[PDB]
Amino acid sequence: LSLSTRVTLAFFMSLVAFAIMLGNALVILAFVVDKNLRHRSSYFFLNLAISDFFVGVISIPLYIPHTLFEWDFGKEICVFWLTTDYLLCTASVYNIVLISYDRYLSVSNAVSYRTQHTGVLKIVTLMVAVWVLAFLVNGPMILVSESWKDEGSECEPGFFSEWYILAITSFLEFVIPVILVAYFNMNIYWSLWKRDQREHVELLRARRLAKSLAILLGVFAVCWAPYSLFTIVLSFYSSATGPKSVWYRIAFWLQWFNSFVNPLLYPLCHKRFQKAFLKIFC
Numbered sequence: 001l002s003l004s005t006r007v008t009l010a011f012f013m014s015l016v017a018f019a020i021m022l023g024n025a026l027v028i029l030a031f032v033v034d035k036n037l038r039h040r041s042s043y044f045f046l047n048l049a050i051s052d053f054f055v056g057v058i059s060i061p062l063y064i065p066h067t068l069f070e071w072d073f074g075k076e077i078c079v080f081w082l083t084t085d086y087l088l089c090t091a092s093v094y095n096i097v098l099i100s101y102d103r104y105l106s107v108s109n110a111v112s113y114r115t116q117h118t119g120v121l122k123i124v125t126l127m128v129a130v131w132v133l134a135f136l137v138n139g140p141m142i143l144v145s146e147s148w149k150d151e152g153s154e155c156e157p158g159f160f161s162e163w164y165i166l167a168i169t170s171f172l173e174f175v176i177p178v179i180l181v182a183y184f185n186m187n188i189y190w191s192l193w194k195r196d197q198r199e200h201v202e203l204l205r206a207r208r209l210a211k212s213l214a215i216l217l218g219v220f221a222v223c224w225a226p227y228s229l230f231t232i233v234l235s236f237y238s239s240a241t242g243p244k245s246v247w248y249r250i251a252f253w254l255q256w257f258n259s260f261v262n263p264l265l266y267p268l269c270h271k272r273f274q275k276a277f278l279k280i281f282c
């Protein structure tokens, strides 16, 4: 490819990485500064922001020279990049699932949710469990499958050669999170709908709630399904390892776009966090 086009692509991808860094940095700054954001939802938002921020800082910036400018990762560097990227992505997915579970509990057991005493230790335990499971899904397999890789230098995970490992990983990182999020969102909507001139206002508010939940679920699914399905299909047809097509690269970038989108949906739509941002920037 021409040097000018490569430079332009590098600039755009660096802009994407900078945006990913900046949104989550703002979220973390709000959490650290306000000190009125010590609720469970705020801690989960902080976890998600940390995950997406370190997606912005490590994964994408390492990606640009490797792909656009032909820098050759070292084997250990490739292992580090793969492990960190998969860990961060799965951690983002699991943080979204945990946020959905928290909102479902707040809407279904509001009395117990309000009266319940939750210490910082339990919230930290939930966050650490999210991270631990995120690692357990991918890393123990990436490190083990590094041996399976051929002599030729390829920085995809080794288990990409086996389609069933891909199927299991996608089941534990995409399918179950999607099902859980859909269940929680549908239950929140059902809660409001059961609770529901006056009828017209109730209909409008129910429509708004449905639209919001559908937007969340659809964004998550649209971002995470393309690449997973592409990888599974290609591995089943043995095309997972080898040259990549343009659509494959777009699907690859969709997950990082999800990492970019998460800050503006879950944190930025919360009134407490909006107040924090307004105070900070004013």
Ligand SMILES: NCCc1c[nH]cn1
Residues within 6 Å of the ligand: 085, 086, 089, 090, 227, 251, 252, 253, 254, 255, 256
């Ligand atoms: N979740 C596997 C790593 C990845 C895919 N797309 C972007 N990063």
